[PDB]
Amino acid sequence: LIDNPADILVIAAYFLLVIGVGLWSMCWWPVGASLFASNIGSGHFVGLAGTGAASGLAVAGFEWNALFVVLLLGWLFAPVYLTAGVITMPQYLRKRFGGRRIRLYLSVLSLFLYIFTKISVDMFSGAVFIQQALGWNIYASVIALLGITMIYTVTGGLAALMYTDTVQTFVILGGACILMGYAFHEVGGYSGLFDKYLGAATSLTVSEDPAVGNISSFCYRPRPDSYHLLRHPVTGDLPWPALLLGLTIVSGWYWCSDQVIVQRCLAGKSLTHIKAGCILCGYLKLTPMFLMVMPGMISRILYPDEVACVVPEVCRRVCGTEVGCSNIAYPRLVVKLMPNGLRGLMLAVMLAALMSSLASIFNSSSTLFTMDIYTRLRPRAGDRELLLVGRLWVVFIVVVSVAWLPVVQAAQGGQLFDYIQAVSSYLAPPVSAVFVLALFVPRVNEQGAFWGLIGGLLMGLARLIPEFSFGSGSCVQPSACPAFLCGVHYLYFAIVLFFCSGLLTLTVSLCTAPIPRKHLHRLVFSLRHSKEEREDLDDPSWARVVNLNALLMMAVAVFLWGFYA
């Protein structure tokens, strides 16, 4: 419903200005802004809003545990990425363990998680945004998104992303604030939302498929525990013992092992400015509740027939998939509530962010592949061969991601955030456990760490592969997946995978002798400060102010946690 002069003109103007900015290059605030830019992504918007609409308020605990994991990065992991002289987590692991097997496995795992949790997610979120605006098919939407991403990459926007990212982080937050205000005004305010959400449900809940038959209230009714982050520890959408503990693992893997954030963080003048950037990122990481989760609840309130679709046929007609329209909440909000003038600007900035992220991820994946896999499979290299290989790899990941859109659409009952977190938790906890063990216990050996990593990979695939093979579905058509394999919340499986990988790493490393201290100097957290050389393997008041600010941030975070408990 954007086919009015007020919308197309603004979108075209916005894209033209972005291209011109890209073309021009052809001729505490920053650190925190860059850190939060990952959560500002439109994929994050869609996932969080859809999960909020589907379940309630609990999905914000993910973001606030990410606050507490950022106050773990800044004070525990950044100081070691500065005492080891290393930059990225795989570089720390290579320096500490040596060899090349660990680095090659990490490169392959990073490429897989880029294709699954980032590339496919961004493509699907852009497709959902375009479908909810132009009413297009998912494949046409992703084709258009890919085309505009190509224009972005060739006009040189990835060479001027400085002036299209850290100032787009203010247009996608002003638009988010304005849309939050509009949604709250439409729903009657804070109290209006909290009175109305529990009573918002679909009216078309019968279905004509004999097997489905009548649909139970449990599925089209909002969860009774929809206003509490502390869901039941066993029968809960987000088992709180996992939302806290079993997420700190995955979120630590992200903010301590995701090259984007690790390097954006290490791009600070001092450790007392990296801490301040982390503090500001945390305060800005408390905002996603009010900006995306509760607006998703308002989306469910205003558009139950669409967002709260429960009938398979209605859900196929609305979502495009029969599982559920959870992940169209924010797109529906944007395309319906906001005015005809600013709606186009909001959609343009969202799509520009999605395609900028896609371009950055394509470039990063090409660089990683060329410099870590083909560089070893053919040491001869050659610039022409490397460029051809990079372009062919971009084509390959684009094709595979396009072939993954149905799975992203139907994953975890149609909840994009649940899909992202499941794919993460099924592959991250192993590397997180290996990294933590390497940081803390010096007994870890290189071959032991590699064997632990690969064992965690195998035992996490033993749950990722069958889950996608059998599907997830919803109450209406529950998947025919084994109970013992599928019932356990993916975060509980995250904890189990973390601990199993740790136990395997200890078992393997205890078989052989440890690496001497000459290769551990200034690498272990317990031996950071030694004032001795190594053989390699190939303030007074500002600090107090930063500490007090961190304490204030934690106090605010715990206040909000208790308020929404």
Binding site: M554, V558, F559, W561, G562, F563, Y564, A565
Partner: peptide
């Protein structure tokens, strides 16, 4: 009420932080 739980959590964490500082001392 919810603000009561928020204040309870804030007080609990402040007490824990004070205990940690005392242990450091």
């Amino acid at each position: 009420q919810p603000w009561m739980q928020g204040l309870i959590a804030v007080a609990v964490f402040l007490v824990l932080v004070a205990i940690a500082f005392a242990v450091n001392h």
